[PDB]
Amino acid sequence: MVSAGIEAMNVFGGTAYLDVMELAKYRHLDTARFENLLMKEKAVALPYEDPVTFGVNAAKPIIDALSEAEKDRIELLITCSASGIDFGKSLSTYIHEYLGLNRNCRLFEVKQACYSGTAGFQMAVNFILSQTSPGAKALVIASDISRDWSYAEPSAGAGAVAVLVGENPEVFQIDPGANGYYGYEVMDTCRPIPDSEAGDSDLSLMSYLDCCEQTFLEYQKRVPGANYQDTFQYLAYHTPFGGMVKGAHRTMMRKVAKVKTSGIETDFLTRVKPGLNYCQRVGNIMGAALFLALASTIDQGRFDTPKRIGCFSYGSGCCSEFYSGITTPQGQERQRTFGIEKHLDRRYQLSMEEYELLFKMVRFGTRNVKLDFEMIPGIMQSTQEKPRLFLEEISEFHRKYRWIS
């Protein structure tokens, strides 16, 4: 009865960020409202980045750490996004090429707003559990770029998280069948126009919270004895902003309760706040948000002994899922190697003049364009860690990328 889940995972939260407290000042936000979001930085995608670049840059460090043998066992590549490049051609075609994966691989894209990431990972888990290809691995990459409204801008991020799924899952071993999924059609938020978003913030909030409770109810119906306090040493949630998550943890704890106010903040600090650390520095990364909170929990939390982590996923539209897995001290050590924090520390800080120039070329249907890596001369020269991918040009709709450092 084979084990399944995460062998390795890595975050790319942009090559550039904005200080979102400075942004609030510039935009004149109500102090209390802005501070209640609980956000500090957002990644900002540049004209020569796209979801392929963002995805390759997240997965590259995983792939570089693997042997040849291991790399050739990746046989499922799934890109989860709401930032598609084509109605038909998936991001996974380009990601596969520039990662140098084996041609013996299924490649496709999965879509369901912010739930995409989980949909991907669940399907990759069932591939491993199915033993249709003994020894094989899957790579799931959630990659999204952003494109009531005044208060959204400080959380509107860009990011990607790449997750390698396999038969030796030290980072996050799933509890198999321990899943409460739940969905129904609601028009809370959508992307009906290319390069554009729409939605009803009060509705999204209600549906998120309704799904947070139903998903757990469903999990419990499948996992007798499941106790929202006792079973899980940490909790990770889909994090569109920190304040949303703090609100929902409070709601859940009162619903499965007999606790005090101070018991609720206590539980927040122990089990939840570790997961919000990276989320606060990247923004809402949509499909990849829960993965980012999960990575955050694993890097920032305490793993002296194995811990069970409870995960809640939500996407607009809507679908959701609660599931759980165990993280070992060894998995925590492996994640340390990627240096996610260190990477986030090295991004280039935009000024408000730089950022206002972008917040107002590479539109979704672009047929030909050549890009200039000097459109902000600092950035490229600024940081030069390892090779990163950038969009160099589109000709006849074909996108061509290049390695730089």
Add this chain to the structure above:
Amino acid sequence: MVSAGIEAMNVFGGTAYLDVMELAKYRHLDTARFENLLMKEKAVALPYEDPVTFGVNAAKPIIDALSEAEKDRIELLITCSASGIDFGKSLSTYIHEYLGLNRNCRLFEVKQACYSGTAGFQMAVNFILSQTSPGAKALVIASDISWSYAEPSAGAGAVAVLVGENPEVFQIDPGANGYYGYEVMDTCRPIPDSEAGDSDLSLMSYLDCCEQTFLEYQKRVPGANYQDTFQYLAYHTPFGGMVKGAHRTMMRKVAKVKTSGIETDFLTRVKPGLNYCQRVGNIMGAALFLALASTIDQGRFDTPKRIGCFSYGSGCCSEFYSGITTPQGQERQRTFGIEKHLDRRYQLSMEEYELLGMVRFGTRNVKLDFEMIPGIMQSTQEKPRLFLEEISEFHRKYRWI
């Protein structure tokens, strides 16, 4: 330890169709070039139809035939398309709602050009083989809607596939799977409501894939032989003529044959599966499933037979896989009356067709006119069908008629 595959499957090849013999006639085409297409009819999507409507109408006869307890076991809904209506919101949200599925369900959309359908099927199969939800089923719905030699094959359609632990219709050979992909710009949909592509490059990749996928399958299934392991073959069928040429190209490489061997083999193993595609047109992610449906209905299953399936999607990714169909599976398929459904579709005149209408991607407010072609609202089907009545602030609203 558990069996897996198709328990039931159904096709919705449109409300209306165009006789493509007449179109070629009326458009003065070179008749050798047109004829080698091997197309007879195509489905034509009306303005009040979209991929939701196509998907629900494909799936609704399956759901009707299920018991309520069976229906409540559908815990995965995958919609497969390149005709998406939103960058984030899957087609599955709306199809879930109008089929009345249980809310204890995962739902999402999958994309990889004409391979989307196979990708979604294979993930559904792995759901079953994982036994992460013993007794669960999935529903996989491929639904798409589309050098004036392209016009006669530009169809619209959907095929719904119920996947489960009791698969009489198509039981998969577990792990008998040869997948193969790489980046190539053969065809794409880079603008909403548009296709671009390179005809030659597409033909080449499709043939490259047909060869590579089979080799991988044989790597995994020792003793597998293109001629004897498979009693029928189904292929991604944008149009009949390319499947005939593909089949011929493969046998040419791999087959010991006498002079009419390739013809005989085409008539025997491939032609059945072409029957429905020639009446519907290229339906992209659903083409292969339509060729499989056609094979099961039109083929001979007095004993269990193995069907090999070849899937291609531009861009590209591809897979060759196989499974068994039983006599009982054919009978269950026959209860859906697919050919009869195709036979009852509304035939458009040439001028009715010429009204070229459409709801563009990204429409925010529109109200549809069901009287745009009045004959169609006249003319009964056996079942209530789903149509698009209105978009309000991007929210699509549907109606049964």
